[PDB]
Amino acid sequence: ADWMPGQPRPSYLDGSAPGDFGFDPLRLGEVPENLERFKESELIHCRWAMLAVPGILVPEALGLGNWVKAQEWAALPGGQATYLGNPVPWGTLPTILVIEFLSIAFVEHQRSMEKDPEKKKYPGGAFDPLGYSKDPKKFHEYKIKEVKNGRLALLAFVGICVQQSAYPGTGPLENLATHLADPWHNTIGNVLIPA
Amino acid sequence: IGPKRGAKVKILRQESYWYKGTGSVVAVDQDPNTRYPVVVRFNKVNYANVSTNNYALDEVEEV
Amino acid sequence: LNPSLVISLSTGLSLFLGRFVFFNFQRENVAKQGLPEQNGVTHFEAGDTRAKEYVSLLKSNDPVGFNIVDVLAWGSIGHIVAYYILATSSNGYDP
Amino acid sequence: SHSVKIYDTCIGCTQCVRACPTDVLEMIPWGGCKAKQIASAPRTEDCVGCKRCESACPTDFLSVRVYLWHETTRSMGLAY
Amino acid sequence: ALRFPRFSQGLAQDPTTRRIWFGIATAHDFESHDDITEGRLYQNIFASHFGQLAIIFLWTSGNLFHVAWQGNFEAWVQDPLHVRPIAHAIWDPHFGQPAVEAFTRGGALGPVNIAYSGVYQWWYTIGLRTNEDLYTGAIFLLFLSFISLLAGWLHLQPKWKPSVSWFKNAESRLNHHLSGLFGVSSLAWAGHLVHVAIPGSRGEYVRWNNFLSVLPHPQGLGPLFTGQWNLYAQNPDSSNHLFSTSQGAGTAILTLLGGFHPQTQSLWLTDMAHHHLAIAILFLIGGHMYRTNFGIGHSIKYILEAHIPPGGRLGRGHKGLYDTINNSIHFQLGLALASLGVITSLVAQHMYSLPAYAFIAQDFTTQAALYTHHQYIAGFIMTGAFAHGAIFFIRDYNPEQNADNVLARMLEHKEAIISHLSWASLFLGFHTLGLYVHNDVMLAFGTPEKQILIEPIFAQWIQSAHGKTSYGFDVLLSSTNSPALNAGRSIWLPGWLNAINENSNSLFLTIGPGDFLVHHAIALGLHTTTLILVKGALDARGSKLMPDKKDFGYSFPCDGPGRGGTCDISAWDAFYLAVFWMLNTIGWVTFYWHWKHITLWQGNVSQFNESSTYLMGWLRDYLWLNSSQLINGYNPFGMNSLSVWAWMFLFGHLVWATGFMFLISWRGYWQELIETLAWAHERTPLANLIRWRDKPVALSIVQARLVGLVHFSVGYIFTYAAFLIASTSGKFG
Amino acid sequence: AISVVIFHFSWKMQSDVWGSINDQGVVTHITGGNFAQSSITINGWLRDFLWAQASQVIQSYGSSLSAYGLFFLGAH
Amino acid sequence: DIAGLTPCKDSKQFAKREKQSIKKLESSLKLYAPDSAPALAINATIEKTKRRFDNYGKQGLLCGADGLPHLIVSGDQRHWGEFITPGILFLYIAGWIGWVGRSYLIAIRDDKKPTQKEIIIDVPLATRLVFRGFSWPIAAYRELLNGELVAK
């Protein structure tokens, strides 16, 4: 097993699946049909966090709004969503709320009707315009690069969420700023060890 | 026929005090008219203070 | 908020969803777990004469078979979503 | 009258017949056990249901079983 | 099949007095009658439910009628805190003149009983005002009683007898019961609160003759259909509202205020109207789940069949369970009794702490009787739930059609289940009793500071999460900036936080070490009672001591003195044993409820906080202290209105103790004795002429367990009710 | 049988025999002759005998008689 | 403080209780000559009463309105002496008793007539097993890991 040298890997994880480093200490994927669903579910999680982590960091580096401040314009009656400074001419709460439900539910239900298991996770066609999946050897290389970047993104999202939990209101980049103030005092040590 | 003397058999008759336990074969009645020919001894008495019972060939399993 | 606009937009979308986007899935699942059975046999087949499926109502000349029960079902969800939006906007709740 | 039944695990040791206080049971010839006899219950209308017979029986799981049932003045043991 | 038990020739042919007894006792066990069919079984049950409805309606009708005819309802409604409500007149020619005077109470012209049922507060709260109101209510329920008998009779006629297949249409009955029996009834009940009860509370008089010309809300249905629902909450009653007057009366019909109407000390009517409307919507939506005649909905069988964990830790999951349940009426009644038992306790717990009825919070004896009545009803109902689980396992369970499913797997590991209940009961008993006995000894030795007095910190932390500030835990609703506190600040939390931190109501009473100990007593009782009952159900089919028990049925005397002895080996006997433990448990819970409240009502909770940590405290400062007025209801110096309860108190002790005879002395002793009386009777001149038609015999083994249990239970209940009512009413808390 | 015999004994002696005599001969019995009008009902034995005379044992805690308090509860 | 209590060292009702208790004993003390055996004995109780009350105050025990110590078993680190700590000690001893008890039934289970060592203790064997209890957590965990602790 690569994920923990000297540890025997589960017998159903042989390293062929992209990102199969033999990690499954609870043996969740011992039921083969669950393993395949879990493969699909992991990629879906990976691709969302890979979109979100830029979305959480890029606007904080730029104009006002850490990923939590970008959401406090709703809730309280009023509604004045601003994209890149300009208040978008439709950024009221019920407008995007319906648009989000209708658009996301439609494309998510469409995803669920695919019967083929390999197209459930690697559909291709329109979503592979540049033909990156044409080469079978190169196809599998990008499969691993996808899952590894996606697991890193999921890991970053957890940090973002857990950091927010510890320093409410702050943003992840402000956390890094506060860290670089004096790294030997502004650490997770304060969180793990109060005062 | 039947298990050998001193065989260690698991009891499979459900209503038996020794069900799923094990005893020792005392004798196997060779008369083919005997419905329950395997005599088995156990080390603990049942509620009637009896320590041995007859079983069928299908009710006994060597272990 | 215009009530007629909210109600008829909600019902419109719900009816649209049930006819064009969710129809196959709902039909597939009804076929999957079909009529209720007692001891391996439908209530009607067992003698519950009052349990006869009303094939007359279920008939429809709609291309996909969207019938009057579908209109009642998806039309009900629309009215429920509509009146949730209307009542929720009628108050001045502050979280 | 109570029901009495004999099962073929019976080894024909006769202990129930001797225990019975109203002569419900008898031994009859049989080819199924070494003793070549099995119990029988032809007079259960006199059966009172004391179950002295079950107390006597050596088989792991009783070969004689008494199912108490409809009461009569015989099963209730009344002398009046 | 020619005399008394027409349904049992087996019993009709019994020449002894036993025939009469068992004819009575088995009349409702339809499954065991001569030549029952499945159809007749359902049909008899179905008609029997109509007869039970008829009795329920008839009973309510009499209560209404007797209050209208002989009660003081019209004076009570004009001064609800200074009039003892009258149940009915009493007319007893055994009374002496001092008993006639003492029982003449209320505004009545003769001896009466005072009602501890709470119907005055109930009927007043929902709108009843006049004796006439009560009369036409009684007549209407009399009509419902009659109609229920008409349908019962009707559906026992061959043209109208329902088929088995109809009784087994589960999906249709659920849809109708959820949306209709529950939903529409709740919706309609909210309609009554809005149209009659709420105007009544605001000094208006809405009845059938005028309700069409009066608006429930000035804006009509406009707001309902436009979605502007907030208008209905707009102008709620003032916190200074005087119930049944327009003083401070508002116009809201649907509110979410939390807490209590400050004068009545009970929930806001406009909150209860909103509650019944809201849950109605949920029942009405929920009643569309199951497939009937229209090509949509679920199959319960398919749903069950799908719920099997991949990985096999529940074997075949729920496969087969639809027909196991749908073909067994004991399974169904077990689930019914189990569920109704939970919610009967819920009723008792929630009604004392969140009363719905104006001026019932200050009617201390009523609150005591109502809590005690439902916790005992709930206890009996819970024992029946397991008893019919046992009966299910014997009469109805098919091992092969349940093979390897969650139900069969319970039987496979019964020793694991039973021995852990045994362990949990042993742990709770040793330590709870050990701790009380330690504290007692410390009190005995003048060293109360050496008690073990564990703080109920987990429950106190839950009370703090609910907003109670007594303990300084500052959690959730006790915090200052929890999102939970922020979200409800604008709605129900102002009225709720007020009620929960008022320490003279019953909402979330303050708790210390005394509450800790008796809660573990209660957990002991729940665990031990279920031990008896679970062990009873799971061994009903067979044990190693009796591996063929299923062939003998639910109740049989025993299996004789062989194999070491087998008294009390049936599942029926496990039930019989569990009743003692249930009566024990409810005793503990009701003692606790009462003693906590009587010291609350008296203004010194500290009497309970200190005397309850040791058992001499309960005996002396609860039972002995609170018996002094009751046992003087009559004495060598006269009597007073507590005379009945003093007499019933001793009556209860007598019935209970008589139960001990049937429980301790067993049959053979008595059969031989009766024989000498048979002889004596046939040898006594003049009496020789008379002859019995039924041979006298001692009671059956099982019969005596029952007769003893019934005596024990009856005296148990009558003793405690006499004490509960007398002690509380002799002072009004 | 023996329980009511000894109860009969205890109540009679405390009521009609035992007690303190005065300087002039005014006897004050322990329970003051209450046996005649009280011991003819079961309520009289409940109230005037058991409930009243149980006072001592249930308030014995904290004194040298407290071992009777514990035995009272233990025997129950 | 925790659960609205206050430290017994600051509690007025706690102090009152000690005072009423000593006064009770002094009412008996005054019956006897000061050299007498009862006087010494009642005085011994009095000093023990005083030691007890100061001890509970110095151990950090919280008191309720009743003036009596109330134990905090929730896990709070200021009160481990009230449950966690004596509880660990109980489980250590209880497991020692049970592990030793099982060692003896196992040691005699293959003997000729095993019930003979159950009604007549083989004391020599028992003196050899009595100290297996010292390490029951390690021994019981080890029999678990290699199929020896539970039967199949």
Ligand code: CLA
């Ligand atoms: C809308 C249609 C409808 C309605 C209203 C009912 C109503 C009823 N059916 Mg049903 N039934 C239906 C359709 C319907 N059915 C269909 C379609 C079928 C065939 C598929 C059946 C087949 C059927 C059978 C076979 C049986 C019934 C039975 C019953 C009765 C149950 C006993 C009872 O009174 O419960 C009353 C229950 C409630 C009011 C619900 C409340 C329950 C909660 C726990 C109580 C809440 C308490 C609340 C707080 C009260 C406040 C306190 C109070 C003092 C005010 C009830 C009258 C039984 C019966 O008795 O027959 C006579 C029976 O045996 N039904």
Ligand code: CLA
């Ligand atoms: C919905 C409620 C309900 C229903 C429909 C049933 C239905 C049934 N039960 Mg069940 N049961 C229930 C609730 C219910 N039970 C509860 C709450 C318990 C807990 C007590 C039980 C405990 C129970 C047991 C232990 C048994 C049954 C049995 C039965 C069956 C026949 C009963 C019979 O013929 O007795 C008819 C009884 C009579 C005609 C008279 C009985 C009188 C009772 C025993 C004493 C009443 C005392 C009374 C208060 C005296 C007052 C004195 C006064 C001074 C105040 C039948 C299938 C029996 C059976 O056949 O199963 C195989 C059986 O043995 N049930």
Ligand code: CLA
């Ligand atoms: C004055 C102090 C005192 C006294 C006299 C007792 C007396 C008793 N306790 Mg208690 N107990 C106490 C303090 C005390 N306890 C404290 C401070 C705690 C908190 C830790 C407990 C927690 C406790 C538990 C959890 C249990 C007892 C049990 C028992 C009974 C048998 C224990 C035994 O050694 O059998 C001799 C030992 C054996 C027969 C071996 C089996 C029993 C032990 C406890 C197993 C221990 C190992 C196991 C891994 C730990 C439990 C795991 C988990 C459940 C916590 C006995 C009535 C047991 C009981 O009630 O059984 C029904 C029991 O299970 N006590």
Ligand code: CLA
């Ligand atoms: C006050 C009376 C009383 C008491 C104390 C008990 C006690 C018990 N019953 Mg019981 N029961 C009673 C009345 C009582 N019952 C009645 C009236 C009935 C109706 C027939 C039943 C029917 C009944 C059934 C059917 C069941 C029980 C069960 C239990 C056990 C419950 C678990 C428990 O608390 O473990 C703790 C144990 C105790 C509290 C017992 C006392 C422990 C003593 C005080 C310790 C002694 C220590 C000391 C050194 C002894 C010195 C004595 C000296 C002479 C040597 C327990 C043994 C259940 C059971 O066995 O669960 C496992 C069970 O299935 N009971």
Ligand code: CLA
């Ligand atoms: C070797 C001793 C031993 C051991 C390891 C256990 C272990 C256990 N018993 Mg058992 N038990 C024992 C003796 C023992 N028992 C004895 C003597 C009795 C008769 C009183 C019981 C009666 C008993 C009951 C009634 C129950 C258990 C239960 C249990 C389990 C949970 C813990 C518990 O409740 O403790 C409870 C312990 C007791 C009630 C009393 C035992 C304590 C004695 C003092 C310990 C043995 C001393 C022994 C003489 C040592 C001699 C050794 C020496 C020669 C070297 C656990 C498997 C429970 C269970 O099955 O849960 C799953 C349960 O319901 N046991």
Ligand SMILES: CC1=C(/C=C/C(C)=C/C=C/C(C)=C/C=C/C=C(C)/C=C/C=C(C)/C=C/C2=C(C)CCCC2(C)C)C(C)(C)CCC1
């Ligand atoms: C033929 C055709 C057509 C037409 C059609 C239409 C136009 C439709 C309509 C339809 C509709 C239009 C429908 C409706 C429905 C409705 C419903 C079905 C409703 C329901 C309701 C409900 C259920 C309600 C409830 C409630 C209440 C009562 C109160 C409040 C609350 C709630 C809301 C819950 C078109 C052109 C398209 C195309 C071609 C063909």
Ligand SMILES: CC1=C(/C=C/C(C)=C/C=C/C(C)=C/C=C/C=C(C)/C=C/C=C(C)/C=C/C2=C(C)CCCC2(C)C)C(C)(C)CCC1
């Ligand atoms: C034997 C038998 C039987 C019987 C059984 C019984 C009798 C049972 C009972 C049971 C019971 C009696 C149980 C109970 C349970 C309960 C529960 C399960 C509950 C839960 C709860 C919850 C979950 C809650 C939660 C919460 C809270 C707490 C707060 C608020 C929020 C919430 C709501 C979330 C039968 C018939 C089946 C059949 C077979 C055999």
Ligand SMILES: CC1=C(C/C=C(\C)CCC[C@H](C)CCC[C@H](C)CCCC(C)C)C(=O)c2ccccc2C1=O
């Ligand atoms: C005392 C009693 C005797 C004898 C008592 C029997 C003969 C009962 C005699 C009762 C007479 C007929 C009076 C019955 C009075 C009842 C109030 C009648 C109620 C009638 C109902 C049908 C309503 C035995 O039957 C015995 C049997 C099993 C062990 C315990 C018992 C029990 O100890």
Ligand code: SF4
């Ligand atoms: S029960 Fe008694 S009488 Fe009937 S057969 Fe067995 S022994 Fe003979």
Ligand code: SF4
């Ligand atoms: S006792 Fe059992 S074995 Fe002996 S004869 Fe009668 S039945 Fe057969």
